[PDB]
Design an enzyme around this catalytic site. Structure first.
Site, mmCIF file in Angstrom:
data_model
loop_
_atom_site.group_PDB
_atom_site.id
_atom_site.type_symbol
_atom_site.label_atom_id
_atom_site.label_comp_id
_atom_site.label_asym_id
_atom_site.label_seq_id
_atom_site.Cartn_x
_atom_site.Cartn_y
_atom_site.Cartn_z
ATOM 1 N N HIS A 113 -3.063 7.261 6.594
ATOM 2 C CA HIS A 113 -2.093 8.241 6.109
ATOM 3 C C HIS A 113 -2.752 9.496 5.603
ATOM 4 C CE1 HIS A 113 1.753 6.215 6.481
ATOM 5 N NE2 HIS A 113 1.381 5.182 5.750
ATOM 6 N N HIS B 179 -4.828 1.032 6.816
ATOM 7 C CA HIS B 179 -3.484 1.578 7.044
ATOM 8 C C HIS B 179 -3.260 2.752 6.080
ATOM 9 C CE1 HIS B 179 0.953 1.112 7.721
ATOM 10 N NE2 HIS B 179 0.966 1.651 6.516
ATOM 11 N N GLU B 180 -3.580 2.539 4.806
ATOM 12 C CA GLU B 180 -3.395 3.664 3.884
ATOM 13 C C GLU B 180 -4.360 4.832 4.147
ATOM 14 O OE1 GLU B 180 -0.731 3.797 2.365
ATOM 15 O OE2 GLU B 180 -0.205 1.727 2.869
ATOM 16 N N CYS C 212 6.227 0.267 7.893
ATOM 17 C CA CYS C 212 5.822 1.406 7.066
ATOM 18 C C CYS C 212 7.043 1.878 6.289
ATOM 19 C CB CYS C 212 5.313 2.527 7.973
ATOM 20 S SG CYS C 212 4.484 3.719 7.021
ATOM 21 N N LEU C 213 6.896 2.055 4.974
ATOM 22 C CA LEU C 213 8.017 2.491 4.139
ATOM 23 C C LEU C 213 8.578 3.836 4.581
ATOM 24 C CD1 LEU C 213 7.515 0.086 2.226
ATOM 25 C CD2 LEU C 213 7.837 1.738 0.357
ATOM 26 N N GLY D 287 0.831 -1.205 0.000
ATOM 27 C CA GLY D 287 0.000 0.000 0.000
ATOM 28 C C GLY D 287 0.857 1.243 0.000
HETATM 29 FE FE FE Z 1 2.312 3.526 5.762
#
Ligand code: FE
Length: 191
Positions: A166, A162-163, A119-120, A72
């Site tokens: 953001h 999760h996305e 998380c990236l 994601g």
């Molecule tokens: Fe994330």
């Protein structure tokens, strides 16, 4: 130039350098809804985001580009404060570029991935159960402005929430229990 202008150039390949990290304010601001019709840039951004997920999941490409595998990505992670997210869950079980996604219904039951979340935009680990809704009904618009209403459960539900977090300026560790990160509260399903 702006991140969106930069990233939507035909030649651009999103890589880890386009992904902002903790501390960058953009990750804590609430993203602006997109209006319809979408600009060509907004459409292209969603496509670039999905291409990035595909590259991050390709062993050959992931290694060459120095990418972390992900399922994601939200526009704020690219420093673009727009309500646009991309999700790509390989079996693909889920593949969608979502514009103005919104949870319109959620289960009383909660869920958390047993192995926790990464998380990236987070270079480190925050262990613990990230508590989310077990099931959600999500409304979003696709690139043509058509509305979709989907129901998610299990891992897909987690990824999408999760996305969406953001674009509301919420990070995964915000939902892990500070006291006891592995506490299994009543009504919490560990996946
Ligand atoms: Fe994330």
């Amino acid at each position: 130039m702006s991140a969106i202008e930069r990233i939507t150039k035909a030649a651009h390949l999103i890589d880890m350098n386009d992904i902002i990290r903790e501390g960058n304010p953009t990750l804590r601001t609430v993203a602006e809804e997109v209006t319809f019709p979408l600009s060509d840039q907004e459409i292209i951004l969603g496509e670039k985001m999905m291409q990035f997920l595909k590259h991050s999941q390709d062993p050959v490409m992931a290694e060459k580009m120095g990418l972390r595998g992900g399922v994601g990505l939200a526009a704020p992670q690219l420093d673009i404060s727009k309500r646009i997210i991309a999700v790509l869950v390989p079996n693909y079980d889920l593949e969608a570029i979502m514009y103005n996604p919104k949870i319109v219904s959620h289960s009383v039951q909660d869920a958390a991935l047993g192995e926790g979340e990464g998380c990236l935009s987070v270079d480190r680990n925050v262990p613990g159960y990230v508590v989310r809704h077990a099931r959600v009904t999500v409304d979003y618009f696709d690139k043509d402005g058509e509305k979709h209403r989907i129901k998610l459960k299990g891992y897909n539900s987690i990824v999408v929430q999760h996305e969406i977090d953001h674009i509301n300026g919420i990070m995964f560790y915000d939902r892990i229990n500070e006291k006891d990160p592995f506490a299994v509260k009543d009504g919490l399903l560990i996946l």
